[PDB]
Amino acid sequence: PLMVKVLDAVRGSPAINVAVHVFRKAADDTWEPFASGKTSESGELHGLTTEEEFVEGIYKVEIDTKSYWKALGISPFHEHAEVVFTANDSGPRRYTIAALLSPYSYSTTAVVTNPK
Amino acid sequence: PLMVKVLDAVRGSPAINVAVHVFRKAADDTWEPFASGKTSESGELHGLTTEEEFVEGIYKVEIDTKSYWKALGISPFHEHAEVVFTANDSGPRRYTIAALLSPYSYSTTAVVTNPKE
Amino acid sequence: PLMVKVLDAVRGSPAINVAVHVFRKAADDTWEPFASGKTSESGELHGLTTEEEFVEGIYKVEIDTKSYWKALGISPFHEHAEVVFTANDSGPRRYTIAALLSPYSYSTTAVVTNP
Amino acid sequence: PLMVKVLDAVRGSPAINVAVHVFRKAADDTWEPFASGKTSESGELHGLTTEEEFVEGIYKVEIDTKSYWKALGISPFHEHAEVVFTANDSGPRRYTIAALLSPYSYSTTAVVTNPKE
Ligand SMILES: O=C(/C=C/c1ccc(O)cc1)c1ccccc1
Ligand SMILES: O=C(/C=C/c1ccc(O)cc1)c1ccccc1
Ligand SMILES: O=C(/C=C/c1ccc(O)cc1)c1ccccc1
Numbered sequence: 001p002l003m004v005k006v007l008d009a010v011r012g013s014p015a016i017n018v019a020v021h022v023f024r025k026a027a028d029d030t031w032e033p034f035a036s037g038k039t040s041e042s043g044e045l046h047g048l049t050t051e052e053e054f055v056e057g058i059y060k061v062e063i064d065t066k067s068y069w070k071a072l073g074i075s076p077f078h079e080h081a082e083v084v085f086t087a088n089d090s091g092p093r094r095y096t097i098a099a100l101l102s103p104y105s106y107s108t109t110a111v112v113t114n115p116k
Numbered sequence: 117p118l119m120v121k122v123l124d125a126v127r128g129s130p131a132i133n134v135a136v137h138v139f140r141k142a143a144d145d146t147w148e149p150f151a152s153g154k155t156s157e158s159g160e161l162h163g164l165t166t167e168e169e170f171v172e173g174i175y176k177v178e179i180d181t182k183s184y185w186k187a188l189g190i191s192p193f194h195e196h197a198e199v200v201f202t203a204n205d206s207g208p209r210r211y212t213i214a215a216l217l218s219p220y221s222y223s224t225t226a227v228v229t230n231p232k233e
Numbered sequence: 234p235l236m237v238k239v240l241d242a243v244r245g246s247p248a249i250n251v252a253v254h255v256f257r258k259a260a261d262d263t264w265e266p267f268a269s270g271k272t273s274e275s276g277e278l279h280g281l282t283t284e285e286e287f288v289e290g291i292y293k294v295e296i297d298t299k300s301y302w303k304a305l306g307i308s309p310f311h312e313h314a315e316v317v318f319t320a321n322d323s324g325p326r327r328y329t330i331a332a333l334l335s336p337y338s339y340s341t342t343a344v345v346t347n348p
Numbered sequence: 349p350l351m352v353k354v355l356d357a358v359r360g361s362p363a364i365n366v367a368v369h370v371f372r373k374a375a376d377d378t379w380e381p382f383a384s385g386k387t388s389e390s391g392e393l394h395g396l397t398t399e400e401e402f403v404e405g406i407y408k409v410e411i412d413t414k415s416y417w418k419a420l421g422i423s424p425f426h427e428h429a430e431v432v433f434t435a436n437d438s439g440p441r442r443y444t445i446a447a448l449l450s451p452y453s454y455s456t457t458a459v460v461t462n463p464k465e
Binding site (some may be wrong): 291301310312313315316317318319335337338339340341342343344345 | 457
């Protein structure tokens with residue numbers, strides 16, 4: 001139901017071991033921790049939640065791009081990359097958040113699909 | 117010293133009248149308002165601050181992409197686009213933050229130049 | 234060994250049924266057809282070639298973006314999206330060419346891995 | 349009428365001194381040279397053509413990304429970045445082709461404007 005994929009545009013490789021922290025916005029307007037993990041050898045992060053755990057709300061996906069670059073000896077521009085979105089419609093959809101990284105640029109896309 | 121440029125990848129045009137809110141991170145770890153404005157006819161936002169007002173710190177540039185799309189009758193994916201970065205940490209630089217928008221995707225880049233060259 | 238993935242940045246979906254034509258540059262500096270296909274329900278195109286068919290050379294991956302947009306009633310800017318690169322020059326690699334599409338913009342990335 | 353802007357996503361800078369070659373497609377389906385230049389200190393290339401010279405047709409803008417990276421000691425993926433498009437098909441327009449570069453990735457976008465406003 002929720003997948004994150006991260007790619008490295010400088011090395012032409014998946015971005016491996018990247019820390020990802022997901023939050024859900026709570027009634028008090030604060031961000032509550034929801035799920036977290038590290039990207040795999042293929043730059044993917046799977047099994048963050050279940051269909052029933054992943055309910056309607058505003059989510060924040062935070063990707064620790066600064067530590068990723070610093071660990072390669074590169075000094076990047078951004079503190080991190082954040083993605084905030086309504087999984088308004090979330091349980092009956094699958095969400096893939098993709099991010100492509102460079103030291104001074106990033107881009108992000110969402111692929112949202114229905115299991116019919 | 118701080119310029120924002122926004123482009124619309126669907127219409128192939130500058131993204132006009134887009135709300136931009138800048139914050140500075142305060143000692144207490146909360147975001148304090150710093151400057152705000154709307155993109156011009158060319159998708160640019162100038163004169164947000166001065167060299168002297170624009171001090172060392174962590175800034176957040178928040179672009180109200182959701183309203184932009186909604187006003188064109190499109191239901192977008194993201195609540196906004198945010199750019200967080202450390203500025204002026206090795207002396208005064210001019211920053212341009214560029215953003216390219218689509219309903220389900222965005223990309224952002226920084227061009228940092230030294231006024232001493 | 235060679236995969237193409239295409240995404241639609243407007244609808245937030247894989248770009249389905251997109252025509253992809255691959256060429257290899259021949260000695261006479263003309264583009265010789267090499268493989269071709271349509272993107273699947275997942276926006277992917279697999280099994281285009283084999284490790285031994287896919288030899289050292291300069292390849293061109295051509296994505297028919299114009300027809301994709303026109304079929305959705307949108308009049309796009311580019312005739313197509315082309316990706317030209319040298320492959321297998323330093324021994325066999327697996328290549329994924331990804332493309333993200335909008336009417337007036339596209340971006341492309343390569344993921345190259347060693348088995 | 350035709351402007352090219354190139355940015356370096358690794359250094360957060362304009363991409364300077366980048367070779368750009370523009371072609372027009374001829375009746376025999378071959379690419380005829382049309383204009384060429386190097387990006388300036390701001391990553392821009394101006395004055396490639398005139399309104400009168402810049403006629404209806406299919407153009408190719410070719411950016412020599414491989415030599416750019418190689419001159420910075422980096423071994424890139426692409427031979428170049430090409431943009432192919434139909435211009436002035438419904439009368440005169442002003443075209444800006446923008447490109448953002450990384451060793452293994454690039455993105456390109458067009459801003460097309462009408463001087464008739
Ligand atoms: O090329 C431009 C195109 C501008 C434009 C403005 C409005 C519009 O609807 C379409 C294009 C331009 C003009 C001034 C500064 C920067 C860029
Ligand atoms: O967002 C992307 C997503 C790529 C992707 C790759 C594999 C996959 O399973 C899902 C998404 C992307 C692709 C090309 C250029 C810039 C960004
Ligand atoms: O903001 C941009 C570049 C700004 C800039 C500022 C200073 C400098 O020296 C070079 C480029 C830009 C312009 C056209 C399309 C997309 C982005």
